[PDB]
Structure of Stage V sporulation protein M:
Amino acid sequence: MKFYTIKLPKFLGGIVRAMLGSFRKD
């Protein structure tokens, strides 16, 4: 939540947004 425990650069950050951007709740 606060930050990813993974030392990733923006893995989920750029990707997970894509997932949501594809979900489009409203």
